[PDB]
Amino acid sequence: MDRKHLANAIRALSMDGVQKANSGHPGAPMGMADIAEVLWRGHLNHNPSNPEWADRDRFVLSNGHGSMLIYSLLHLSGYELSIDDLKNFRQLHSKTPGHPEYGYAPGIETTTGPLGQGITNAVGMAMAEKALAAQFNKEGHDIVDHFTYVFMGDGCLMEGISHEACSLAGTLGLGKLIAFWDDNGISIDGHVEGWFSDDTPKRFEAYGWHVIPAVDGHNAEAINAAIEAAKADPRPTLICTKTIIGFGSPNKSGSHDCHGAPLGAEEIAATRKELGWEHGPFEIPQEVYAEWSAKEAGAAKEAAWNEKFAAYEAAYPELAAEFKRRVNGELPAQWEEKANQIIADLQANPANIASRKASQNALEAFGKMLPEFMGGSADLAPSNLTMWSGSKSLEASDFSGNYIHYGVREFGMTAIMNGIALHGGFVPYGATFLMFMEYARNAMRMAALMKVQNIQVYTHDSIGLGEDGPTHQPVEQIASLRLTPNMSTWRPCDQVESAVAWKLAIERKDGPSALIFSRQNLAQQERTAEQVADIAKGGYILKDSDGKPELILIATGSEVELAVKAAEQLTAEGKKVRVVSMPATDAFDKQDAAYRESVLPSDVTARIAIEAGITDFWYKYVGFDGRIIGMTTFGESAPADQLFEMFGFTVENVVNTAKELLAENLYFQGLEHH
Amino acid sequence: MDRKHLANAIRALSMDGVQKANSGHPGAPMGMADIAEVLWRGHLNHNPSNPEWADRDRFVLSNGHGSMLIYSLLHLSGYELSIDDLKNFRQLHSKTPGHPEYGYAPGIETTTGPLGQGITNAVGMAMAEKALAAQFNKEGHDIVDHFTYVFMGDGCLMEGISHEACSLAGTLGLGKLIAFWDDNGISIDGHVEGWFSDDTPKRFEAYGWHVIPAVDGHNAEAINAAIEAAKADPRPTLICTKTIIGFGSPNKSGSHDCHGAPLGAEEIAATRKELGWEHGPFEIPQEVYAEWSAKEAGAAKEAAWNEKFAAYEAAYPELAAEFKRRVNGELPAQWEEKANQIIADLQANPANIASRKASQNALEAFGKMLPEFMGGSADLAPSNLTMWSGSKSLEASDFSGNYIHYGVREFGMTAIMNGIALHGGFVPYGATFLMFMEYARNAMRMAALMKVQNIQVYTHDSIGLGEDGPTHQPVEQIASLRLTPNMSTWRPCDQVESAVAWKLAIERKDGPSALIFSRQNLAQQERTAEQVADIAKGGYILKDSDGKPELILIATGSEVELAVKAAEQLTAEGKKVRVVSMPATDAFDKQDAAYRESVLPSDVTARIAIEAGITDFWYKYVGFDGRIIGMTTFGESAPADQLFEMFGFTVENVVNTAKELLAENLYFQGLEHHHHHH
Ligand SMILES: Cc1ncc(C[n+]2csc(CCOP(=O)(O)OP(=O)(O)O)c2C)c(N)n1
Ligand SMILES: Cc1ncc(C[n+]2csc(CCOP(=O)(O)OP(=O)(O)O)c2C)c(N)n1
Ligand SMILES: [Mg+2]
Ligand SMILES: [Mg+2]
């Protein structure tokens, strides 16, 4: 069968899927159909019967609004995604949401939609392939060998994160990363000349990429030749495919009218005429299904690879076992035993250190067990302390290491790490000052949405950092992480909580981990072995009164010592005071009602939350009858001890607030609470 | 004097200021001291006695951590920044914080520190100059004519926002923007080759910039030639100044050790010897002060510009009064009565339209009175509805307009706008989907920290946007804006609250405004004239009960209609229900205790907050005894009305929740009723 009929099946399913939904974006799927057909039928190595084949090529659709394109590709080639699924595009609980979502449909490699992050995830997956290949491939046994293909549009290229991702991808020499730019000259505002006029080829040459300019995106021969050139060049390749958006529509192609609205029934009939497509809505001839099917090619490719791996396993049994364990996301053999012993050693051996130093100590203790670590920092290795004795930097000519110098690229680093975690085989971690979490904010939201592991070491977490001032001092950042669905946010109060937070983060594979560490030194607290085990519950009783407490101090991270010292002075003045350490509110929230009531009994309304962060978050735990000692403003440039005093993080202020609060409990005004 | 000696006065003050503080970054100041001396003493047009002079050149230190460089320049050239101020570097309440802060120290044009935003601010500043020139300059009367100079380091160039700002600046032909890149081969991790290897001149060439590569940043003649070439070229110019970081220090120069730590007393003495600087800590000889002073040149330059403006005013009195009005940040003559008439007309003439359309209607109605408007959208003009009939796009060849197509550049747009607001002459607004506020988040924070106007039209504010799904559907974003100090976040519930929010945002010149607009139609609510006036208080009684309420429904934005309907049903079943509209919690928080108690009385604890956003924010207003009807998950891709029903935003659920809540609260009251204590 002729090629153009096969490409035209993509266009028909796309425009029909969008029309039945009366919602969605037919432009880009129709403009890129030829490129997709050449790539998918001619070059992509994948098995539709096993979307998790470890050595499959990875395809990412970074211009994610053209979701019908990838849904069309998955259905046509034989994945478990049916015509009825396409008929349910953008409908309640379907496998075909309006933007493609990881784990919603088989073969979707990442969730896209926020522009720029698809290409950045793809840079990550290319880095994972290259590192796995450098760590596992042996002479005559190259068991890691697959490419990363990305489609992107003008929106992705305008976004700043494309500059971070692709600059670093050049430095690191990611020759198996192959990106197709949908150069169609249009974005939502219309003709892009007024706002997007880069020499895009020259830009990517400046990144050290291999760039193939001026490729006719509707010539199957030019597309095939560009892909062949790309696979042969050892630098990442940008293929600049010039296309017509909405290709096939007589009246709406080359216009922003076809970008993100249904074509309409009249225009759709005219498009079928123009393309010579004589089949109605969702009708694919069996001949097309035959020529598009990838099931037997893919079954043969995986069977071959399974034999390739069996040979590898005979010759390198220990390495093969490591490869199996890591690509399945399994922990090391004695993980639980060894990790818990490390934690108990820390509780036995108090150090008063900064929790960022405790973080480095946990990396050193746990990392000896975790060859799958792939750490890094956005140019802050000596302040975040993300390197330990075993850290080895990745470089273009040697990807066998385990540490990435991301440069000043918080957003790119965080979304690269999503691509690494999605790829499999590693436990990635990254780092920056907690303030500059904000530069990478949406990539962390995307990890929560995708339910992938993404461990962020966020140091310098409050006014405790001191002189660098209010552009650096977090105030509201911790709360904005706590308010994010499926974010796990840990603010350890000492080296023991720090190591527990790291152990849980390493184990946390269904969502991101924000590990919040202090610049300044933190006093270690005494804990029974039950209390150590209760750290993992996110909120636990650290100090208790004899008998029911009349006052509960809830504190996090660096403010716990302040709570403990104020509770000591109040106890010596006759008061019954409990101190609750709350390293992770999200873990505390998931504990059963019985546990939570045991920690914060509802009948004790005299509670004070103490945290060098935005106060308004804490009404959740103290309500109207409690008090909050926190921040309500930006910080100031000064030494930290002066900042803590100025902003009220003093034992005297906690004690006075407590006595004032206890006085409001007179005249039965507290006992009346129910 | 020898040129090098005047530059070394910068190096001396910088390293001495860092040493006294035992904190800060001496490397970059010492690296760029020669570039700074040539620029400031040989080209910068400024008046130390009036840092507010309208036609002064703008200087921006984008590598903000080298703050002792700009503090040295300000003190050396004659600004009101004393030796004692420099001796208080990084100390509590000083004029010299660890990163430079606009608003206190004279001469600080923006707050920097977060890498990449300074250069982006400068793009906006150059955009403001070029537009103010196009709108006001006449033949023989060019009253607007200044340059925008920026120093920036490798960190700013690695950051993605530099791509957004400089790509657009190329497209717009900002020829009076002149950026110096501190090309010293070093960042915090060390030698940058393992993580930063762009062909940076070629990169900027690709942006349509004028690039001057390989300038010796310690050669005054080369630096000077580069600047002259820059000012002659009509494209924005990148001057690639190679420097040695910490230049002068024998043992720490060219190394990341001098980046962000004090040099040490012994290294400083060796550095003094190496530089031939024979003066003690903070000691500046008199002939250095005399050679550095810009006071006389600066007073002459401004005096000359004042005469140019007197000539302009004589020739063009109406344009001149407009220039003075806009440069002084004043609103048009009849703003208050005309804007209030627009708002009263909307209350009188109900329309059920999406608040994003009401946003467009406010732009149209208010924009006719505001030639200072400078709007835009990050490639979403037809969805955000940011263009009205008077919108005219800026073009490289025609900057007389009032609208910017920012492209898909949320972070760059937002930080450019801070630059526009800092420059003066405009009321800027930008726009994107509320979700992609997250891309621009820290530029919104910087606006709030700096207390500058920055109006953002954030549309498609909830699961109400429907099928695009959870990558687009905001859940926790409104609450993140509400927790930011000096953020004003407005979620209007109909076209009347929408126009009030726009009126107050246009007036809000000391902080950013986040205006949260719906995709879908919103029912207009009825209001007395007093209720219309109380919209501006951020929270007010929309529907009161007959007698003291036993239940309060608190709602925002698209969920106010839901609360009104639920109250109607509850009132029909005999309950006493109050509906509070809370378009802006931050404005409500600032009302006095009497007003807040009148809206939310402490006696009435049966409260329900209703909002298609993250639930846990609302504990501030409902406490432990209320309920919250909101989101606790990401959204899902489906039609909007099925999402609202699935996530509990129905009259049935609100009514059922209220009835349970009241039965519970009446039960607990009953256990207490016969007790004798208060
Ligand atoms: C970060 C981000 N900002 C904004 C949007 C909104 N948006 C979706 S598609 C699009 C237009 C970009 O056009 P292009 O990538 O050229 O695609 P085409 O219309 O050619 O298919 C925009 C602004 C988004 N999805 N993500
Ligand atoms: C957005 C952001 N990310 C990280 C930082 C932390 N930081 C401050 S200075 C710096 C080093 C950047 O190096 P460069 O700009 O080359 O400065 P130089 O040391 O040469 O003066 C870093 C990572 C920051 N200030 N802002
Ligand atoms: Mg396009
Ligand atoms: Mg540098």
Curated annotation (Swiss-Prot), chain B:
Its cofactor is Mg(2+); Ca(2+); Mn(2+); Co(2+). Binds 1 Mg(2+) ion per subunit. Can also utilize other divalent metal cations, such as Ca(2+), Mn(2+) and Co(2+). Binds 1 thiamine pyrophosphate per subunit. GO terms for cellular component: cytosol. Keywords: Calcium, Magnesium, Metal-binding, Thiamine pyrophosphate, Transferase. InterPro entries: THDP-binding, Transketo_C/PFOR_II, Transketolase-like_C_2, Transketolase-like_Pyr-bd, Transketolase_bac-like, Transketolase_BS, Transketolase_CS, Transketolase_fam. The keyword Metal-binding applies. The keyword Metal-binding applies. Mg(2+) binds at D154, N184, I186. It catalyses: D-sedoheptulose 7-phosphate + D-glyceraldehyde 3-phosphate = aldehydo-D-ribose 5-phosphate + D-xylulose 5-phosphate. It comes from the Bacteria. It holds the Pfam family Transketolase_C_1. SUPFAM superfamilies: Thiamin diphosphate-binding fold (THDP-binding), TK C-terminal domain-like. Its EC number is 2.2.1.1. Thiamine diphosphate binds at H65, G113, P114, L115, G155, N184, H259, F436. Homodimer. NCBIfam families: tktlase_bact (TIGR00232). This is Transketolase 2. It comes from Vibrio vulnificus (strain YJ016).
